């Protein structure tokens, strides 16, 4: 397991989705991702997790109407082709069908600031974007009271890793309590299913396992 992978759930990180730890050990050949991509602010994101205490997950409550949400890939095999455990891959539900302008708002009910992660998909070919998300301009915008940014796919071939020319890029935010993150997208968007909550921000309500040290080690455990 790569550490960042605990947040979004590749098959690797299946055991450690809701782990509780005083000491966290990263390992060298670990891969944060099943389908090739990289986290924005990656090194900064891990340092958060190492000292988290572990993480608790709860569903963001999103529901969908007319879309394929069950997107699967050769990259996330898991008995049969699959995806990130904690996200949904959204597709047109009929090939080459232009994707719906949709909006989502999720609001941070809990006292601890939530961790939210989302994806932008850069399709293997200009064709594949079309097949997947329909045709025309693609825009994704993420809005929070402290955060707003807009993302667009830049579709092309890239060197084949894990058998995929396509890439998924993850962007994350910290959401204060009582704050709404608004998700608006016409496609190419990988959606959070679950919010990540640190355990050292818990109220001593027995999830709470405070203040871990994350190390990098080649040694066994004892």
């Amino acid at each position, epitope marked *: 397991c790569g550490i960042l992978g605990t947040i979004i759930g590749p098959p690797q990180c299946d055991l450690h989705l809701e782990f509780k730890a005083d000491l966290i050990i990263e390992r060298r050949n670990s891969s944060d991702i099943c389908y*090739p991509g*990289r986290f924005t602010n990656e090194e900064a994101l891990r340092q958060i997790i190492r000292e988290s205490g572990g993480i608790d997950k709860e569903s963001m409550g999103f529901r969908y109407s007319g879309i394929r949400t069950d997107g699967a890939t050769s990259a996330c095999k898991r008995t049969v082709s699959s995806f990130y455990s904690e996200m949904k891959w959204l597709s047109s539900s009929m090939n080459n069908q232009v994707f719906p302008q949709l909006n989502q708002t999720y609001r941070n009910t809990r006292k601890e600031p939530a961790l939210i992660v989302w994806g932008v998909h850069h399709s293997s070919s200009l064709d594949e974007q079309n097949k997947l998300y329909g045709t025309g301009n693609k825009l994704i915008t993420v809005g929070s009271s402290k955060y707003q940014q807009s993302f667009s796919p830049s579709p*092309g071939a890239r060197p084949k*890793v894990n058998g995929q020319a396509g890439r998924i890029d993850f962007h994350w935010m910290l959401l204060d309590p009582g704050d709404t993150v608004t998700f608006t997208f016409n496609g190419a968007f990988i959606a959070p299913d679950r919010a990540t909550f640190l355990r050292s921000n818990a109220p001593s309500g027995i999830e709470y396992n405070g203040k871990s040290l994350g190390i990098q080690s080649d040694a066994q455990i004892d």
Partner: antibody
Framework: QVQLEESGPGLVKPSETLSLTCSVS??????????WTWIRQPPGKGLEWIGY???????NYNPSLKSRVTMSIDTSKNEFSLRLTSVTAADTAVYFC??????????????????WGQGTLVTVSS | DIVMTQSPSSLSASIGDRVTITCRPS??????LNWFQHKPGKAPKLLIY???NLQSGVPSRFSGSGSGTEFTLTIRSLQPEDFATYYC?????????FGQGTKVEIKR
């Protein structure tokens, strides 16, 4: 998904300027994520990376050559080019143009050319 | 400025044989290592990217392994069309640098 055809003189006299062009087919040289690279191989020697250029203007040239080399992208002709000044016999080589895709999860910026042309020989001689 | 030491410089092997080429960079480069194939008069071709990822059109008899300071290209059952010069290439810092190459010749 892209084709890359190199062109240029073939013979350049010592101390003169070497110019090469790469005709690109199948993609546009105006794309935000690709970079365009030159590499060379002297007869019987190793491959030597020359540099990369992005449409946005970002470039990086091998320090062995940086004070003599420039590259440019011609958007109108869908081409990119190499210019190498004050050549000597050490610059006789097969010159390859290549495309790569920015991929900072797996590669330094501009450092993984993955679609190459077949190369064109340049001989520096009087 | 990272020096790539490839070995052997040349080898000969029979059709169907398993061939192994090693690359040792002068410093640890994690997985930022690519393998190229160069057949006479054709464009050099990226075979393996990021130490182990097979490129489109490359036969599965080709495999890359290793990380850090030792990398291996294996060709598991040599075919006549695999006659070529193979190069490793580090993508870890600028300038990208190449191994001096391994010429693979076929015994028949």
């Amino acid at each position: 998904q892209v084709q890359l055809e190199e062109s240029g003189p073939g013979l350049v006299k010592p101390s003169e300027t070497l110019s090469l062009t790469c005709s690109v087919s199948g993609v546009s040289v105006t794309s935000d994520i690709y970079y365009w690279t030159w590499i060379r191989q002297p007869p019987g020697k190793g491959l030597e990376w020359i540099g990369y250029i992005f449409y946005n203007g970002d470039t990086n040239y091998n320090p062995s050559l940086k004070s003599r080399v420039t590259m440019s992208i011609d958007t109108s002709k869908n081409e990119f080019s190499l210019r190498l000044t004050s050549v000597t016999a050490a610059d006789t080589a097969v010159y390859f143009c290549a495309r790569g895709t920015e991929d900072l999860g797996y590669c330094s910026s501009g450092s993984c050319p993955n679609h190459w042309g077949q190369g064109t020989l340049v001989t520096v001689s009087s | 400025d990272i020096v790539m030491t490839q070995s052997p410089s040349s080898l000969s092997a029979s059709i169907g044989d398993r061939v192994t080429i090693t690359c040792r960079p002068s410093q640890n480069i994690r997985s930022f290592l690519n393998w190229f194939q160069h057949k006479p008069g054709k464009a050099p071709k990226l075979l393996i990217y990021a130490a182990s990822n097979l490129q489109s059109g490359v036969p599965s008899r080709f495999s890359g392994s290793g990380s850090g300071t030792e990398f291996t290209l294996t060709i598991r059952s040599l075919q006549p069309e695999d006659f070529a010069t193979y190069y490793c290439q580090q993508s870890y810092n600028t300038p990208p640098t190449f191994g001096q190459g391994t010429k693979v010749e076929i015994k028949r």
